[PDB]
């Protein structure tokens, strides 16, 4: 009936377009992050998995801003990852950059759209040196 056709249209078109744009932007964002991270001995292979513990985000902001960030907390728990993500996000708030719908648990849980939006906001609004 109508509901089955509507579900088929949604599942094909919306998801296909969203995934295509998402993977293209993820690929190019990963290349840009690796290009700016090549100054230090750091390299990421997957954007979603490697940003969970928050060390790479802190080092990327350290490279881009050119000023010293607070020392990351020592630990391997989930709450230490939340701390490490929270430090970088709160520093971004300090640099007057407006982040929206941003939390530590979104980065730690690896939500794709929010990670891509955070990287895109850093690319757009953050001024380098």
């Amino acid at each position: 009936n109508d509901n089955s056709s509507a579900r088929l249209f949604e599942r094909s078109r919306i998801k296909a377009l969203a995934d295509e744009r998402e993977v293209v932007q993820k690929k190019t964002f990963t290349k840009w992050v690796n290009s700016h991270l090549a100054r230090v001995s750091c390299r990421i292979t997957d954007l979603y998995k490697d940003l969970r513990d928050g060390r790479m985000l802190i080092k990327l902001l350290e490279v881009l801003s050119g000023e010293m960030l607070p020392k990351p907390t020592k630990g391997k728990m989930r709450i230490h990852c939340l701390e490490n993500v929270d430090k970088a996000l709160q520093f971004l708030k300090e640099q007057r950059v407006h982040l929206e719908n941003m939390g530590s648990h979104d980065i730690v849980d690896g939500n794709h759209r929010l990670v891509l939006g955070l990287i895109w906001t850093i690319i757009l609004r953050f001024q380098i040196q």
Partner: protein, 70 residues
Amino acid sequence: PDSNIYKKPPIYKQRSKHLIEDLIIESSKFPAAQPPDPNQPAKIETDYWPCPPSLAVVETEWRKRKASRR
């Protein structure tokens, strides 16, 4: 009274940064976040467009199907 709408430029056309970041900014303007395929038809040409076409195209499709059926 005597002018052509299409020859004029669009109204919204009328009105330092890092080069790679400019490249990523103007790469995101495309709907697919990448330059379009050159020899590929647009979305309107494709027949998987959900909206129905004009009636003459339907008559042409009917005649093609009838010639295929023989």
